[PDB]
C-alpha cells in the first residue's frame, strides 16, 4: 500500500490548486507517522486508535502553506487559506500532517512557485477546489485590468532562506477517511 509517493513526493502543488490521491485496497502502519513531522493531529477519530479500524476509502491531499498558516488546516478555522484555498468540514474525520521544508522549498533569492487565493466572493465549501484566476471586483461585476477596482485573486508565497519560522514553507498532507 503506497504512501512514500505522497509523503516523499519530489514536488507539491499550491494550496489553492491542491491535489488529491486515492488510497484503497490495502493497509499500512499508521506507526509510520515520527520526528519527521511537526504537526500530526487527528479529528473525529482518535490518533491512538487508528490501526484498529477499517476504511472503505482514504484520501490524501497534498500542498504547501507557510508556517503560521498551518493552524488553518483544521475544522472551524478562519483565514485566507481555510476560507479560500482548502476547507475542512466541522465533522471532519481524519488526520492532518505537516512538516518544515525550508531546506528544499526556500531559496536564497526566493522561491515563488507556491501560491494562494486571497480574494473570492464567498468562502469555499468543505473539500471544494477553485483554480479559476479571474479578475476580482469587490462590486461583483466582471472587470478587465488595468481597470480600477479590478484585482488579481492570487498571490505568491515568497519563500526566502532568511524568513522566520512563521513564513517558512511547510508541506502538508491531509488524510480523509470513510
Amino acid at each position, epitope marked *: 500500500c503506497p504512501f512514500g509517493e505522497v509523503f516523499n513526493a519530489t514536488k507539491f502543488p499550491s494550496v489553492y490548486a491542491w491535489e488529491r490521491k486515492k488510497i484503497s485496497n490495502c493497509v499500512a502502519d499508521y506507526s509510520v507517522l515520527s520526528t519527521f513531522f*511537526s504537526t500530526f493531529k487527528c479529528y473525529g477519530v482518535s490518533a491512538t486508535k487508528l490501526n484498529d479500524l477499517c476504511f472503505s476509502n482514504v484520501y490524501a491531499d497534498s500542498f504547501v502553506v507557510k508556517g503560521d498558516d498551518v493552524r488553518q488546516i483544521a475544522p472551524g478555522q478562519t483565514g485566507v487559506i481555510a476560507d479560500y484555498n482548502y476547507k475542512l468540514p466541522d465533522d471532519f474525520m481524519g488526520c492532518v500532517l505537516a512538516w*518544515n521544508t*525550508r531546506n528544499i522549498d526556500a531559496t536564497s533569492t526566493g522561491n515563488y512557485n507556491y501560491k494562494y487565493r486571497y480574494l473570492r466572493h464567498g468562502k469555499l465549501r468543505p473539500f471544494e477546489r477553485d483554480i479559476s484566476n479571474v479578475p476580482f471586483s469587490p462590486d461583483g461585476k466582471p472587470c478587465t485590468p488595468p481597470a480600477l477596482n479590478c484585482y488579481w485573486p492570487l498571490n505568491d508565497y515568497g519563500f526566502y532562506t532568511t524568513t522566520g519560522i512563521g513564513y517558512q514553507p511547510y508541506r502538508v498532507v491531509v488524510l480523509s477517511f470513510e
Partner: antibody
Amino acid sequence: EVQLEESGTVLARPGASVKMSCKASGYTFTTYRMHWIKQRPGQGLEWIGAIYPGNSDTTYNQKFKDKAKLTAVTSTSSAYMELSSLTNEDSAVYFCTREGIPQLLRTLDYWGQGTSVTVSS
Amino acid sequence: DILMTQSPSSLSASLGERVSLTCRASQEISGYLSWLQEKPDGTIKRLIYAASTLDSGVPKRFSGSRSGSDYSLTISSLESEDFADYYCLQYVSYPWTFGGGTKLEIKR
C-alpha cells in the same frame, strides 16, 4: 515546564575547538528552531545562527559562517554548537533560545542560562 | 541586515521614577520586536514580545508601544531589580539583530 539547560563553563586554548550544548525539555525539540546568541564581556548581544532538529536544516550568520557548527541529537533532545580556530575574540558568553509557531509569540520566550567560554594558552 | 538603533545607551534614574527606552528599526518589522532584560548574573528574561504584549509573570510596570519605526519600552515606577541591562531585537527575519543595549543605573 519548558527550560533550556546549557553545558558548564569551559576553558580552551587558542586555535583549539570546543563544543557546548543546550538541552531542551518540556516541549517538542523537533518543532522549534534553536538559536544561538553570543555576548562578549561588557559588549552587546549578537546572533550566531540556528538549527532545526526536525531535519537538521541550518541557518548561519554570515559573520560566524566559518567559526561555528550546529549539530543536533533528537534522541537526547540536545542542540550543539562547536567553535573552532579559537581566538581571543571568541572569549564570551553564549546563549541558546527558541523560535516556534506562531513566530510572533513562540520565540525568545525561554533562554539557556548562558555558557562561558574563555580562551587562554 | 535590519539595523536596530537603541537609545539611550545609558540611563540614570531613581526608585519610583518613570522611564522609556526607544528602538528604531531601519526596515518594516511588522511588530516583531521584543525587549529583553539581562540581570548582572547573566540570566536573560523576555519582557515584551510582539511589540507591546507583556510576557507572563512580568510586572505591570512594564509595557511596550509601537509608533512608526519607533518602538519603546516603558516602566511606570522603577524598582530595585529593574536596574539592569535592556536589549531590543527584531525577530522577523534572519539574521536576528539587536540594539546596542541600555544600562540602567541608580542616580545619586
